[PDB]
């Protein structure tokens, strides 16, 4: 588990991942435009979300 | 008549989607929160562009 969601994110777009506060994530930063590609370890869903909605954990 | 600035961008936002508004840090905004999904409908007072962006990317101004 690499990251954690810090704010609620409700998708508007089909490619986006829904986040609740405190969701644990496996994620990779797409640094060309600062979106994460991620797997939500609470829901099992996949998709993208804007980078400042998550912190790195280690 | 005047409209006061409502919000200020705090993080860089680079659109992936046609309806989105590009933000640079400290950009001045006129914006209205959409409560069903916590996106703003906004006008960027620096760039003159319009579109949507996610709520955590801006603060309220006074």
Residue numbers in the entry:
A (entry chain AAA): 491 to 548
B (entry chain BBB): -2 to 58, 61
Paper text:
Accordingly, we designed four different mutants of JIP1-SH3 (H493A, V517A, V517L and A541L) and obtained their high-resolution structures by X-ray crystallography. Of note, three mutants (H493A, V517A and A541L) induce a staggered conformation of Y526, with χ2 dihedral angles ranging from −41° to −75°, whereas V517L shows an eclipsed conformation of Y526 and an almost identical structure to the wild-type protein. This suggests that they are in fast–intermediate exchange between two conformations represented by the crystal structures of the wild-type protein and of the H493A/V517A variants. In agreement with this, both variants show line broadening and chemical exchange contributions as detected by 15N and 1HN relaxation dispersion. Analysis of these data shows that the structural features of the minor state of the wild-type protein are captured by the H493A/V517A crystal structures, as shown by the excellent agreement between the ΔδCPMG values for the wild-type protein and the two variants. In addition, the analysis yields exchange rates between the staggered (canonical β-strand) and the eclipsed (classic β-bulge) conformation of kEX = 2,830 ± 70 s−1 (H493A) and kEX = 6,800 ± 300 s−1 (V517A), compared to kEX = 2,600 ± 70 s−1 determined for the wild-type protein.
NMR studies in the 1970s demonstrated that aromatic side chains can undergo ring flips—that is, 180° rotations of the χ2 dihedral angle (Cβ–Cγ axis)—even when engaged in stabilizing interactions in the hydrophobic core. Our data therefore suggest that the conformation of the aromatic ring at position 526 is determined by steric interactions dictated by the size of the surrounding amino acids.
